[PDB]
Amino acid sequence: TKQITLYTATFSPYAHRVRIALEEAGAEYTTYDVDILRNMPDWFPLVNPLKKIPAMTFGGPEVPPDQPSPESAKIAESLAMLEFIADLFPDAKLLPTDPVLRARARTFMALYENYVNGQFRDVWFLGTPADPLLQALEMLQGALPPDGGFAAGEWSIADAAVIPFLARMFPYLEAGLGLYSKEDGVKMRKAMASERFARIRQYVRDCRARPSFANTWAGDAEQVEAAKTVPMLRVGEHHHH
């Protein structure tokens, strides 16, 4: 198989998505953990001109990750990477075969990206109000099959897309990480433990139980420590509405 190199960082939920999918695929791959606390290496724009993590190279000669080759394909954007891995490894069935079930997976990924993800970003990094995030999570939970299972029934890349963010939410809340107020932290912790969110808590447990999560997660406390190194999580800053 043509080589896969993923440029990643422990804190990054977008990178985590692609690590999960690569584990589920059974792929051979290399990871290279960047250090955002130091100057970005001058080679990094060769693998992602937008200066984003994850970055992915595919094919080309086998080279050290810090010496990327011009011959490798440079694949940008985590959701594009998820669909790429699903295309590369059809025997791993990272999407359903049925068109309608595949659409459920794609719909779930779009619902998350369009209505939930920006709320996580704004509540955590800007300290905007928590209620719209809780409303968007309740909407997303309503898209899950009610009786159990994953977004499209069997596990798929839709679950790789979403679990990195939901799995960080619980330990980040408990550690008090984020720019939201104390009041909104209390509200979120009570809501996420309440009966209204029992289905999404089961979904999180089901996704975390898979080896693809265990093998790509540093541990709750270690992930909290990695997130504390993120400059935009301006420590000691909180916003109040």
Added chain:
Amino acid sequence: TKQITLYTATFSPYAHRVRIALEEAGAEYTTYDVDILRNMPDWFPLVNPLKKIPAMTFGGPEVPPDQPSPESAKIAESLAMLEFIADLFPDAKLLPTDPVLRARARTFMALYENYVNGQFRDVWFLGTPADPLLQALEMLQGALPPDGGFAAGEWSIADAAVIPFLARMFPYLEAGLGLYSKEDGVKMRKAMASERFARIRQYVRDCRARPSFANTWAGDAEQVEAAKTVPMLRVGEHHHH
């Protein structure tokens, strides 16, 4: 053989995406145009509970669009619909077969969704400064093959995803529709006419020349009039500095 119904509106670039893809697929389908100036029908949340257009039903008995059946699948989110149409009509080759070229298509869609679409929204609906939108458009332009072609080479759903927005930009600017100032309107019109943006103009021309655009566009002047009906475009209102 299963029925497709698309709930649409002329002004909506998101619905336009799916009309283009259905044309390219050679699908048999029904459209039902909603009227956002009157009360939303009580049946509409049965097809989409987020109150969004487009909405799609698939399968079930043939029924009038205003009497949707519980037996049809209810598909939400325009990009999920595009991928669904590609899956349903494999002989139409609405995505490449090669995995790397497929990833170019997905990347282009993610670049537009994540970095460009929100700039269009800020500038048109809030009147924020135009420079970040021009920067994001230059980035998107840079992702196209420079010597010609569509986003992934051959035409794909990536081009159905992006042309509705780029095609509206030119006539909207010429009509002065959107919350940006005259100064930023002049700036954008000059920029989009300059050699800096020749490649994206070629892209717009190439996408517009296909029958799938012609058969799904009401004409520039008619599309402008339809957009004037949108409340959040606040016709007559402009924000300065």
